[PDB]
Design a protein around this ligand. Sequence first.
Ligand SMILES: CC[C@@H](NC(=O)c1ccc(Cl)cc1)[C@H]1[C@@H]2C[C@@H](Oc3ccnc4ccccc34)C[C@@H]21
Ligand SMILES: CC[C@@H](NC(=O)c1ccc(Cl)cc1)[C@H]1[C@@H]2C[C@@H](Oc3ccnc4ccccc34)C[C@@H]21
Lengths: 375, 375
Amino acid sequence: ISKEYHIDEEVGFALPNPQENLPDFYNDWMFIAKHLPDLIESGQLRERVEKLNMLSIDHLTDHKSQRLARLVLGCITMAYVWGKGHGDVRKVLPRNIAVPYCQLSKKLELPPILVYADCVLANWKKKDPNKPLTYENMDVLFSFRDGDCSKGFFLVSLLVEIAAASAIKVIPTVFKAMQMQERDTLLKALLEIASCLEKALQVFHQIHDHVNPKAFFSVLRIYLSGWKGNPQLSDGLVYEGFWEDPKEFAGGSAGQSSVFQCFDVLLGIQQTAGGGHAAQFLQDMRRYMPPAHRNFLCSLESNPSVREFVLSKGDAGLREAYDACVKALVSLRSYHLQIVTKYILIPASQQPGTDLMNFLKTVRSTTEKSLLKEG
Amino acid sequence: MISKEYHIDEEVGFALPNPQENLPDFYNDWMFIAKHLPDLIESGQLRERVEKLNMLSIDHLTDHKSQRLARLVLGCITMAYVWGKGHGDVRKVLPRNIAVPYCQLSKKLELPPILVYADCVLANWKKKDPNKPLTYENMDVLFSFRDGDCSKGFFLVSLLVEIAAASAIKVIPTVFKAMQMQERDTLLKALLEIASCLEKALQVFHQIHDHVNPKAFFSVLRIYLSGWKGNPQLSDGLVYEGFWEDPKEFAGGSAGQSSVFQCFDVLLGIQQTAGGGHAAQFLQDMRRYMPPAHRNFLCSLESNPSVREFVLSKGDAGLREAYDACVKALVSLRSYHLQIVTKYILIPASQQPGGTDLMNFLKTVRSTTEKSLLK
Ligand SMILES: CC[C@@H](NC(=O)c1ccc(Cl)cc1)[C@H]1[C@@H]2C[C@@H](Oc3ccnc4ccccc34)C[C@@H]21
Ligand SMILES: CC[C@@H](NC(=O)c1ccc(Cl)cc1)[C@H]1[C@@H]2C[C@@H](Oc3ccnc4ccccc34)C[C@@H]21
């Protein structure tokens, strides 16, 4: 894989060893971002952001410091917009934060809202660098509220991204085997991908130890929410000093994960084909991924179809191995639907989530229908 | 210099070189209807003739050129059938005999089952005399809808603009090689060469006034190019009988489906698809209405390093001037397009007892182009 796609041998689409501290110049951003639970509870978040001077982004020289700054400002933005998460909202992001956040956003080519790539892919650290990438040796950099289970939700997502990284590095082998007409290597490679996505499902299981349904639904979900098709901000958000009209941007989503999409693309499971809402949504989320990763996806599409290759050969072993990859994705979707019932639907029904359920039902359905032989 | 997998011709660029006029005998029934659309629509014979067709297999369309002609054929028939005489009586259902093969062929070519720019411009032409050049006077379209519809003018002037732009497309490898090799003089020359062709392409655009009449365009041709995405006349889309039980929405023909309309923006790092705006949304969506080879090309352009960041980093007035000349030439093309939309859509509409949408789209594209100036 070309290093120009920003994919790591070890952590895959995750930003390897993200930067924790910014330059001292940015101490005022860092303070607020580091103390969102405390500032929100004390009712001083909106006051502190308003007392900020407009800082230059020019001292953010490298990619990682720029990415750290995006996480910092995106979390501050979510805290500023949503407040205590009980309906009192702001519809104007002040210039002192809005301007540099948008400057930095345009430069990195992400929209100025917190995305998956901020709060999962850049939002982590090893505790001891020598010790391996395990939950106990890891931690998130930023959270919204005390008891929000943001560490669990984000790190468990990150660990799935990492798990899937072992499959990602096999992708080159697949197209090379196709180009070379090397059937045995193709078979071996597809089995290895299947094996890696199976492992990734076991990593997904860890969620239950680190996230409870009430804390996620009643708190965390709120702070990840966006302002595209949201009654609370019908027309979107005003980035004072940068854009004159309010702009709409979608909130965080698993559809923003590149591993959530790349294996569908690999296997010719045409998730973005046809006019359907799920397809549209999945394509739209490419623009919420970093450009290099967005580029990885559409360049996978430009390569020849693994599916048509496999369909044409009259080779049961190849078909089995292709199906094993597909089956593994079905399993990941099914497990996700279970997680959506426990963490969204049930909590919702108790008060005096369905779109995500149906979205995932469609994604699972499309995945399952791309099997060559039934699972 | 440009890979053949991207289906770009050196002479005609994104246009299908030397398009096919006649399909196999097996499809004489498709061809009779398509070649006589003016007579069959006016006389109200069109719909019955389509209705009495037998469902032909797409297996006998062997080569890409014949496969593309067949789309041009079925696409026009589909618009005729849907819109009829263009007076408001429409068909919410496309019959299985035509719909099944059109959908099967569409899936095969990775295009949606609706007439697109690549059908009715890039594949809808012939030379009168092969020995004489690619000029309006030596050329003809293959299919029109109605008498007096100016489809010759509208389609061929679009094609000639595509062809004029082809001169610049072949310089794209020079640009990327020059960056990689750190060849400043080559890059300057290359950018100036690109700006020269886009300036030329603007003068080719001026011909539209000689061959196209506002009334005829607005009241006749525009109706046959309309699709069924966000259209009050088919609110749920069209039923493709036999293929889907539910009606699917698809957008009508558009300049945003032209690959040259998009590719130089990408080249020059103008982020027309950035932000969550409507114009950016549309341009991305229209990539899936381009032939997949051309869709891929735009994707590989995106994935290459930024010409804009290169010119900006270098601190070189000459390079900046040569880059700005390319941007200035794109601005002029959008400005000219807007004047045409005023003449051909806005004014006619004012006299009649989504022109504003197309104007706003173009205004957003022009604005974004202007903002990429360096001076
Ligand atoms: C708490 C965990 C949950 N996380 C989120 O939903 C999430 C949502 C918004 C944000 Cl801002 C951050 C995280 C879960 C991760 C891993 C999950 O992986 C996958 C699911 C389904 N299919 C797949 C096919 C291939 C590869 C991975 C897949 C998606 C997502
Ligand atoms: C009647 C002509 C007009 N045609 C159409 O709008 C048209 C619309 C729908 C269909 Cl089904 C067929 C044609 C015009 C062509 C060439 C026009 O080129 C360009 C405009 C603006 N900017 C540009 C920047 C770079 C390169 C080309 C550009 C676009 C479009």
